[PDB]
Amino acid sequence: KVFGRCELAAAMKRHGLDNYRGYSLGNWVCAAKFESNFNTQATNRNTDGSTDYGILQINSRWWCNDGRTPGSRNLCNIPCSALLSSDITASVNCAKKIVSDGNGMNAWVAWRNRCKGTDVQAWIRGCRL
Ligand code: NA
């Protein structure tokens, strides 16, 4: 599913992500636009052989099992394919674990390079929240 901007904000808000670990909703919507374009089905391969899955491009070296990333962990205890659902629950739940891990949202490269330090409240402007 390809979300609209406000539709995804609302979804993220309902799943408790606004101000999770001190990260406002705009930061999460901005991260999702630059990671996936707001596509749940987005997959990207990494040079190391791991793969990033879903709206928030979560990586199978640490976080999910895809059966084809040797030696990897599965901290979120989910198949990577479940990160591709139209229902974002599993992605949000796993992203709460990731941002908790010590580096905050800097775990998402496109957040650090394209969202950090910018006016991220623009990403939720206009929305009925
Ligand atoms: Na894995």
Short mmCIF file of C-alpha atoms and ligand atoms in Angstrom, two decimals:
data_model
loop_
_atom_site.label_atom_id
_atom_site.label_comp_id
_atom_site.label_asym_id
_atom_site.label_seq_id
_atom_site.Cartn_x
_atom_site.Cartn_y
_atom_site.Cartn_z
CA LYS A 1 0.00 0.00 0.00
CA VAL A 2 1.16 3.46 -0.78
CA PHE A 3 0.05 5.82 2.02
CA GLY A 4 -0.88 9.33 1.72
CA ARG A 5 1.08 11.69 4.02
CA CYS A 6 -1.76 12.56 6.40
CA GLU A 7 -3.12 9.05 6.31
CA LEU A 8 0.24 7.71 7.50
CA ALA A 9 0.55 10.36 10.19
CA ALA A 10 -2.73 9.32 11.54
CA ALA A 11 -1.83 5.69 11.47
CA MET A 12 1.48 6.37 13.24
CA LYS A 13 -0.26 8.48 15.86
CA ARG A 14 -2.73 5.75 16.58
CA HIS A 15 0.08 3.28 17.07
CA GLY A 16 1.81 5.54 19.59
CA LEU A 17 4.80 6.53 17.61
CA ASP A 18 4.08 10.93 18.34
CA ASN A 19 6.74 11.75 20.76
CA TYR A 20 7.97 8.12 21.17
CA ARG A 21 11.40 8.47 22.78
CA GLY A 22 10.97 12.15 22.30
CA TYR A 23 10.54 11.98 18.50
CA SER A 24 7.53 13.89 17.33
CA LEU A 25 5.29 12.56 14.57
CA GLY A 26 6.82 14.74 11.83
CA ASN A 27 10.22 13.00 12.27
CA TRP A 28 8.54 9.59 11.69
CA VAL A 29 6.64 10.76 8.59
CA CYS A 30 9.71 12.42 7.18
CA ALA A 31 11.75 9.19 7.77
CA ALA A 32 9.05 7.12 6.06
CA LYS A 33 8.90 9.46 3.00
CA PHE A 34 12.63 9.31 2.35
CA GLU A 35 13.13 5.64 3.34
CA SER A 36 10.19 3.99 1.42
CA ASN A 37 8.03 7.01 -0.34
CA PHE A 38 5.50 5.93 1.71
CA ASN A 39 5.39 2.40 0.07
CA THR A 40 4.79 -0.58 2.51
CA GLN A 41 6.13 -2.98 -0.11
CA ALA A 42 9.57 -1.27 -0.57
CA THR A 43 12.56 -3.66 -0.42
CA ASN A 44 16.30 -2.67 -0.97
CA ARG A 45 19.37 -4.86 -0.99
CA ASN A 46 22.54 -3.91 0.92
CA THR A 47 26.16 -4.73 -0.21
CA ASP A 48 26.58 -6.84 2.91
CA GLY A 49 23.77 -9.18 1.64
CA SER A 50 21.11 -7.97 4.13
CA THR A 51 17.84 -6.38 2.93
CA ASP A 52 15.69 -3.47 4.17
CA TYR A 53 11.96 -4.03 4.29
CA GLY A 54 8.91 -1.82 4.36
CA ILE A 55 7.81 1.63 5.17
CA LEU A 56 10.69 2.24 7.50
CA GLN A 57 13.32 0.11 5.62
CA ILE A 58 14.22 -2.08 8.54
CA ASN A 59 17.25 -4.28 8.06
CA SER A 60 17.51 -8.06 8.23
CA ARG A 61 21.04 -8.18 9.66
CA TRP A 62 19.61 -7.34 13.07
CA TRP A 63 15.89 -6.99 13.18
CA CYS A 64 13.92 -9.57 11.12
CA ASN A 65 14.42 -12.96 9.57
CA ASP A 66 14.48 -13.35 5.80
CA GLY A 67 16.26 -16.69 5.62
CA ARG A 68 19.04 -15.34 3.52
CA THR A 69 21.15 -13.11 5.76
CA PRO A 70 23.83 -15.41 7.36
CA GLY A 71 24.65 -14.97 10.95
CA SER A 72 22.05 -12.35 11.37
CA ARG A 73 19.79 -11.69 14.32
CA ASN A 74 16.04 -11.36 14.46
CA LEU A 75 15.51 -8.94 17.44
CA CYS A 76 12.08 -8.07 16.49
CA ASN A 77 11.12 -11.78 16.28
CA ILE A 78 9.29 -11.44 13.00
CA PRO A 79 9.78 -12.66 9.40
CA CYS A 80 10.96 -9.72 7.26
CA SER A 81 8.03 -10.21 4.91
CA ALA A 82 5.61 -9.14 7.70
CA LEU A 83 7.19 -5.63 7.42
CA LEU A 84 5.58 -5.33 4.00
CA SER A 85 1.94 -5.53 5.11
CA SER A 86 -0.64 -2.85 4.49
CA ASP A 87 -1.10 -2.86 8.27
CA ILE A 88 1.89 -1.03 9.74
CA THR A 89 1.66 -2.54 13.22
CA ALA A 90 4.62 -4.85 12.87
CA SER A 91 6.80 -2.10 11.38
CA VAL A 92 5.88 0.30 14.15
CA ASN A 93 6.48 -2.20 16.88
CA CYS A 94 9.88 -3.05 15.53
CA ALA A 95 10.81 0.58 14.97
CA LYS A 96 10.08 1.26 18.67
CA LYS A 97 12.67 -1.35 19.52
CA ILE A 98 15.21 0.13 17.08
CA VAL A 99 14.95 3.76 18.24
CA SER A 100 15.33 2.47 21.86
CA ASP A 101 18.64 0.81 21.01
CA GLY A 102 20.90 3.77 21.92
CA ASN A 103 21.35 5.83 18.68
CA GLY A 104 17.82 7.06 18.47
CA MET A 105 16.56 7.92 14.96
CA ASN A 106 20.12 8.07 13.64
CA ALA A 107 19.60 4.32 12.94
CA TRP A 108 17.70 5.55 9.79
CA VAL A 109 20.24 7.05 7.39
CA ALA A 110 17.73 8.96 5.44
CA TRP A 111 16.42 10.52 8.67
CA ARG A 112 19.89 11.68 9.68
CA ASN A 113 20.64 13.06 6.17
CA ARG A 114 17.31 14.47 5.11
CA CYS A 115 15.18 15.07 8.20
CA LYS A 116 17.38 15.74 11.23
CA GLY A 117 17.55 19.45 11.95
CA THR A 118 14.90 20.41 9.44
CA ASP A 119 11.39 21.75 10.00
CA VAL A 120 9.80 18.35 10.34
CA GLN A 121 6.51 19.67 11.55
CA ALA A 122 5.84 20.54 7.89
CA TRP A 123 5.21 16.83 7.35
CA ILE A 124 2.07 16.89 9.45
CA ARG A 125 0.75 20.31 8.43
CA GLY A 126 -2.72 20.31 7.14
CA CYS A 127 -3.58 16.98 8.67
CA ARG A 128 -6.51 16.27 10.88
CA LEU A 129 -4.75 14.70 13.84
NA NA B 1 17.99 -11.58 10.36
#
